[PDB]
Amino acid sequence: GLSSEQQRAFLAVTQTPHPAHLITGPAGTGKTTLLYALQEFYKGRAVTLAPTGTAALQARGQTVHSFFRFPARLLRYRHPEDIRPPGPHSPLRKAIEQMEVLILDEVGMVRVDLLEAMDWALRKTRKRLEEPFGGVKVLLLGDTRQLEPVVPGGEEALYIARTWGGPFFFQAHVWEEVALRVHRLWESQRQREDPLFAELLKRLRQGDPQALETLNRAAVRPDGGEEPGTLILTPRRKEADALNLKRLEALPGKPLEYQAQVKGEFAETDFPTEAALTLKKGAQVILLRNDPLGEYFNGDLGWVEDLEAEALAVRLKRNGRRVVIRPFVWEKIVYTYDSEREEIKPQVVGTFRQVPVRLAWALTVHKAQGLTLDKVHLELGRGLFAHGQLYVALTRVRRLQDLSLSRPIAPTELLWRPEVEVFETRIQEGIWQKSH
DNA sequence: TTTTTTT
Incomplete structure (x- = not known):
C-alpha cells in the first residue's frame, strides 16, 4: 500500500x-x-x-x-x-x-x-x-x-x-x-493539506529569504501565545523558563519542590533541568530520560498527576498512561588533552541527581525538535541563532495557520x-x- | 555565544 x-x-x-x-x-x-x-x-x-x-x-x-x-x-x-x-x-x-x-x-x-x-x-x-x-x-x-x-x-x-x-x-x-x-x-502530507506552507518551506530549505515575506505576513501575530492549546517555543532557555514560571504561579494548587543533589564539579549552566524544580498537580511537563522499560521517552509531554517525596506520577499526552518518575543521575565529563599523544581521555568529574522533569508550557526550539505539535507560537526574543533552527521551529505544526510569530523573522535568522x-x-x- | 541527543 x-x-x-x-x-x-x-x-x-x-x-x-x-x-x-x-x-x-x-x-x-x-x-x-x-x-x-x-x-x-x-x-x-x-x-x-x-x-x-x-x-x-x-x-x-x-x-x-x-x-x-x-x-x-x-x-x-x-x-x-x-x-x-x-x-x-x-x-x-x-x-x-x-x-x-x-x-x-x-x-x-x-x-x-x-x-x-x-x-x-x-x-x-x-x-x-x-x-x-x-x-x-x-x-x-x-x-x-x-x-x-x-x-x-x-x-x-x-x-x-x-x-x-x-x-x-x-x-x-x-x-x-x-x-x-x-x-x-x-511528496508530503503538507503538500496536500497546506500547499502554500509546503511551497514556502521548500524555498526556505533553499535559503531564499524572500519567502520570509509571505511567512511574516501570514503568521506574525503577537497575541498568538495567549490562545488556548498553544505551546510556546523560544530560542533560549531563560525566556522559556520565565514563561513556565508565570504559568506555574498562576496555576491553582499546592507546590512541591524537588531539590537536585550535586556531587563533585557540575556547573549550574550544565544542569539538564532545574536544581530547584517546583511542580504542581496539573503542571505541563516534559520528561527528560528514556525509560529502560520503554514506558516513556526523553521528550514525552504530560501532566503532573501525583507529587510525593522523590517520586511523582505523570499522565502522558502521547498515550494517556500514567508513569511513575523517580530521580535520575547525569554525569559531567571533562576531556583532558595529553599534549604528547593525540590521546584525549574522558573523566567523570561530577554528578547531578534530579527527577527527569522540566516544565513545558514553553520549550526551546532545540527541545521541540522531533515533536509534532498542534498549535505553536514562536516567541523570538533575542532571535534565532542556529543552523536549521527556523526550519525546525516552523515544521513542528501541520499548517501555516497553526503557527504564529511574536515578530517578523529577519533574514539573519534563516541559517544553513x-x-x-x-x-x-x-x-x-x-x-x-x-x-x- | 547557544542549544540539544545519548545511559
Missing part, C-alpha cells in the same frame, strides 16, 4: 545487492509508511535503530546506544574503551552476527562518531573488518535538514574537527569505502551551514561517493 514514489524507493532498496542506501525526504507519514513496509519485508533479518528515544519509538526500534551498549559520551574512532563488542555467548552477539539489514531512522540527527561506532562495532563483532558495517546492508532514512548534532565545547569539539572535519553523518570515513545510493521522497548545503547539492545525483 505505497505510493508510486514510495514503491520506487522500496524496490530500489530491496531488489539490489547494493549495501548502502539513503532515503531522504521532509519525513513524517510517508517516511514512516515506507519504513514499516521495509520492516515487513525484512522481518527477522533487520534491526531498526534511531539516534533518539522518541525517534526510536516512532520507528518501532531502539536507540543506537541501547542496542550496541555504547556509553553516553564521545565515541573515539575505533577506540576499544568506547566501542566494545559483545561477549562470546551473548544474545547481542547473536543478533549482530545474524543481522542482514540495519535500518537507521532520522539519520540527519546521527552524529558522525555514532555512525562510525556502528560501523566498527559491526565489523569487529562479525569479524569482517574489510567491509563497511561488516557486510550489513544499511538503510538510512530521514531529512537531511535538522539541527546540527550536539557538540560540546572544549577538547571534544576539537577531536571531532580533527578526526572527521565536522559532526555530520556524511563526514564519516566509512563512506570513503562504500557508495551511498540516494532515493528522494518529494555551507558544508551541509554542499552535501545536499551532491546527493542530487542519485548516488554519492565520499572523497579520500
Whole structure:
C-alpha cells in the first residue's frame, strides 16, 4: 500500500545487492509508511535503530546506544574503551552476527562518531573488518535538514574537527569505502493539506529569504501565545523558563519542590533541568530520560498527576498512561588533552541527581525538535541563532495557520551551514561517493 | 555565544 514514489524507493532498496542506501525526504507519514513496509519485508533479518528515544519509538526500534551498549559520551574512532563488542555467548552477539539489514531512522540527527561506532562495532563483532558495517546492508532514512548534532565545547569539539572535519553523518570515513545510493521522497502530507506552507518551506530549505515575506505576513501575530492549546517555543532557555514560571504561579494548587543533589564539579549552566524544580498537580511537563522499560521517552509531554517525596506520577499526552518518575543521575565529563599523544581521555568529574522533569508550557526550539505539535507560537526574543533552527521551529505544526510569530523573522535568522548545503547539492545525483 | 541527543 505505497505510493508510486514510495514503491520506487522500496524496490530500489530491496531488489539490489547494493549495501548502502539513503532515503531522504521532509519525513513524517510517508517516511514512516515506507519504513514499516521495509520492516515487513525484512522481518527477522533487520534491526531498526534511531539516534533518539522518541525517534526510536516512532520507528518501532531502539536507540543506537541501547542496542550496541555504547556509553553516553564521545565515541573515539575505533577506540576499544568506547566501542566494545559483545561477549562470546551473548544474545547481542547473536543478533549482530545474524543481522542482514540495519535500518537507521532520522539519520540527519546521527552524529558522525555514532555512525562510525556502528560501523566498527559491526565489523569487529562479525569479524569482517574489510567491509563497511561488516557486510550489513544499511538503510538510512530521514531529512537531511535538522539541527546540527550536539557538540560540546572544549577538547571534544576539537577531536571531532580533527578526526572527521565536522559532526555530520556524511563526514564519516566509512563512506570513503562504500557508495551511498540516494532515493528522494518529494511528496508530503503538507503538500496536500497546506500547499502554500509546503511551497514556502521548500524555498526556505533553499535559503531564499524572500519567502520570509509571505511567512511574516501570514503568521506574525503577537497575541498568538495567549490562545488556548498553544505551546510556546523560544530560542533560549531563560525566556522559556520565565514563561513556565508565570504559568506555574498562576496555576491553582499546592507546590512541591524537588531539590537536585550535586556531587563533585557540575556547573549550574550544565544542569539538564532545574536544581530547584517546583511542580504542581496539573503542571505541563516534559520528561527528560528514556525509560529502560520503554514506558516513556526523553521528550514525552504530560501532566503532573501525583507529587510525593522523590517520586511523582505523570499522565502522558502521547498515550494517556500514567508513569511513575523517580530521580535520575547525569554525569559531567571533562576531556583532558595529553599534549604528547593525540590521546584525549574522558573523566567523570561530577554528578547531578534530579527527577527527569522540566516544565513545558514553553520549550526551546532545540527541545521541540522531533515533536509534532498542534498549535505553536514562536516567541523570538533575542532571535534565532542556529543552523536549521527556523526550519525546525516552523515544521513542528501541520499548517501555516497553526503557527504564529511574536515578530517578523529577519533574514539573519534563516541559517544553513555551507558544508551541509554542499552535501545536499551532491546527493542530487542519485548516488554519492565520499572523497579520500 | 547557544542549544540539544545519548545511559
